[PDB]
Homo-oligomer: A and B are copies of this chain.
Amino acid sequence: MLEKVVIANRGEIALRILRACKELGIKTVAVHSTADRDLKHVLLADETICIGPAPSAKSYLNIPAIIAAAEVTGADAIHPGYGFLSENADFAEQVERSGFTFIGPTADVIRLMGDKVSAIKAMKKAGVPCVPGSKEIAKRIGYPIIIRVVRSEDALEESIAMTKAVYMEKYLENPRHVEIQVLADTHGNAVYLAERDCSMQRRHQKVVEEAPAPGITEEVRRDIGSRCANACVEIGYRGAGTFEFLYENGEFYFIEMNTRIQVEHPVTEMITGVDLVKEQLRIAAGLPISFKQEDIKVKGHAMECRINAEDPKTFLPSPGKVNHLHSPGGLGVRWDSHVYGGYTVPPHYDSMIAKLITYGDTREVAIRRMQNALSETIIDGIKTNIPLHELILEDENFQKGGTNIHYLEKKL
């Protein structure tokens, strides 16, 4: 089985992975850049290997250095986390060709779902609902469409010329972002783990996520979920994955499959009692999913706020030394973070410093727990987006639930 895993990532997800490994008695190898020697997970890992200088291109995206790290430590597997190389099929193929287990899908399936086109075709074949699309095509679909968004037909031709200098589909004006978590194993099983609503976004970048999605009934959950699970089997999916949908007037429209773990996986953990990273590790080792579809029942409600080191108004990054950290706790409060007092947040990577996750028996309780946890949270020395979260949580439309993917931008 898996005895030693290279954690080919950094920051909070690297720590998340290390925690799962340590629970399973799996030895860890932390590969890191020169700028990341003081990362919490690096300090906790069984072995450490510096894979390059600060820039991602020369370290966390350095395929030969990461593979060499696996070789010299005698590792069995590599966990890519999210971002960086996690959906790089050339990386996955090289990992397997080098004799290591890639903790994720097979390269071929990554490539398949890594092409906007083949993805849709595979989903349509599998019965997963997609956005209508593909001269009179635009007409068939119904305006507005998108090649440049086109709202009228007299502008279609010119628009197509602009963009070409190459396909269409229905533009949904005000949809929600709703995504279905799945797991698939090497024993022919695939399960769905309810859904997440991640509609609160700025520039297509998620800010707050929750589970389950407000308004979604169990009947609807079972319908869309079962289609996603079937799809997994049809394409030979392996590991954790997410089917992302635009959701509008009660209809789902596939937009992308993330063939990896996602940042917001913890809200699903809280409402289903599944440890998604441990399942990744078990599935990669060849084991079956540790439960059946009938074992899963949504209970309660969970929310996640991505706490970023950035100015809460202009959103410019705020690197620097965290002089004081006070993290919240108590019942129904979860804190997933690599940051500690005295830690210096570097400029080289993303701005995430923590994920604050709350759970309650109702959405109302989860929201109030999030507000109270935020009020207890102190991060001194750098700016954070905590004030933005506090604005979102007290928003009357957010309290009602069901705000669309353009709402946050409209607000502000």
The interface of chain A, by Cβ under 8 A from chain B, is 15-16, 19, 22-23, 40, 44, 266, 269, 273, 275, 299-300, 324-327, 329-337, 340-342, 361, 365, 368-369, 372, 375-376, 378
Do most interface residues of chain A lie in helix, strand or loop, or is the interface mixed? mixed
Residues of chain B within 8 A of A331, CB atoms compared = 19, 266, 269, 275, 334
Alpha-carbon separation in the docked complex, A189 to B175 (Å): 46
Chain B residue at minimal CB-CB distance from A339: B326
Chain B residue at minimal CB-CB distance from A324: B341
CB of A23 within 8 A of CB of B365, answer: yes
- A23-B369, A23-B372, A372-B22 given; A330·B326 CB < 8 A: no
Chain B residue at minimal CB-CB distance from A364: B23
Chain B nearest CB: distance from A79 CB in Å? 15
CB of B326 within 8 A of CB of A340, answer: yes
Residues of chain B within 8 A of A334, CB atoms compared = 329-331, 333
Alpha-carbon separation in the docked complex, A376 to B326 (Å): 16
A-B contact pairs, 10 of them (CB 8 A): A19-B372, A22-B368, A23-B372, A275-B331, A324-B341, A326-B340, A327-B327, A327-B329, A329-B336, A329-B337
Other A-B contacts than A273-B361, A275-B331, A330-B334, 13 sampled, CB-CB below 8 A, are A19-B331, A19-B372, A44-B376, A275-B332, A324-B341, A324-B342, A325-B341, A326-B341, A327-B329, A329-B336, A330-B335, A333-B334, A341-B341
Alpha-carbon separation in the docked complex, A325 to B369 (Å): 23
Alpha-carbon separation in the docked complex, A341 to B336 (Å): 18
Alpha-carbon separation in the docked complex, A300 to B15 (Å): 24
- A23-B365, A341-B324 given; A16·B376 CB < 8 A: no
Alpha-carbon separation in the docked complex, A400 to B277 (Å): 27
